[PDB]
Design a protein around this ligand. Sequence first.
Ligand SMILES: NC1=N[C@@]2(CO1)c1cc(-c3cccnc3F)ccc1Oc1c(F)cc(C3=CCOCC3)cc12
Length: 370
Amino acid sequence: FVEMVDNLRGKSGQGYYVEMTVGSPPQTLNILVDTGSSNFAVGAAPHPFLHRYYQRQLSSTYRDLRKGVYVPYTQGKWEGELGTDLVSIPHGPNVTVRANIAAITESDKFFINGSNWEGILGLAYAEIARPDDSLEPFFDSLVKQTHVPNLFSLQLCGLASVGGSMIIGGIDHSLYTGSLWYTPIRREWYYEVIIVRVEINGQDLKMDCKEYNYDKSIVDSGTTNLRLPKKVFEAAVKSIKAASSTEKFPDGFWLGEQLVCWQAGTTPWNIFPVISLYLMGEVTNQSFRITILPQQYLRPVDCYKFAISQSSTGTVMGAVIMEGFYVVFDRARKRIGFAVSACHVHDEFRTAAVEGPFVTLDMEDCGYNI
Ligand SMILES: NC1=N[C@@]2(CO1)c1cc(-c3cccnc3F)ccc1Oc1c(F)cc(C3=CCOCC3)cc12
């Protein structure tokens, strides 16, 4: 899938985007790739932050659905007008599909000042689409209307410019080393998974594993940080604090309230512990683990921010997790694959890892239910 490699760009902390076209003749837009939502929505008015926007008046293939959509989320809001049009991905499969497009006509804290994207591609499932699950997500339309296989994979490589690959309809083996290990998609809404054990430098946090997935754990390309439920974050910080105690930092730093700095080239990587998440495996009583480095959870702003934070919406495996791995969203088999990314950032002492099998009992009890 050579044509799709390196089809993602971005700025640190502002997400990864892919070039798309909408309408006839095609209008080119850069679109944020978001596995944590399910709408395709694009700027359609001259907001001052935008390089460009969708001009429905210029598209002969535009169809109005004559319905509005209103989308508040935890950190912002957009609203718009529903329609369909022809959509393609220039550095994707050689196909063109008729997709739902929300033309964004009002927004708050959605667009980012200085960013180079103009819309959002929600790759999650219809259950969390707005206004409801009748609005078919883009990927659902793509698979229904073409022979593109029902899967995609992401290699996120990490203002400094970031890069990556979105392989639509397949897997590119040059993007990872070792084997893929798969964890089940628990339910098709978000890309929900189940974490069955957590270790900091190989030391089990020893919490009831339900806490790790309260109220859910998801794989989310549209979140920068690793977000952990409050109780788990407390416990994880406590352990990370202890493991790194040879150098002392202010309390606010652990809350993301301030940075920490060292002289260029002397960041003490080795004093910071690795973080391991064991995920439910494909087989009964079988798990595997993924392990990330401080290179993943200490974000450049040599100064750095702590990129793990507390959550009230469950665990979010954001860019901090994903930049460690090649991640396969195997929708066809209701599973997510992880393999060590060929592009992840590390040092000569430690590298991100995907390892298994491990023996883990009562993994079904780790899932949260109402
Ligand atoms: N993953 C996720 N995507 C969000 C929030 O988190 C998001 C992230 C970004 C962003 C910002 C910075 C860096 N990287 C990003 F992806 C930008 C804009 C943005 O917009 C929306 C949005 F409009 C709706 C929703 C939802 C709609 C319906 O229910 C599910 C949530 C989520 C998001």
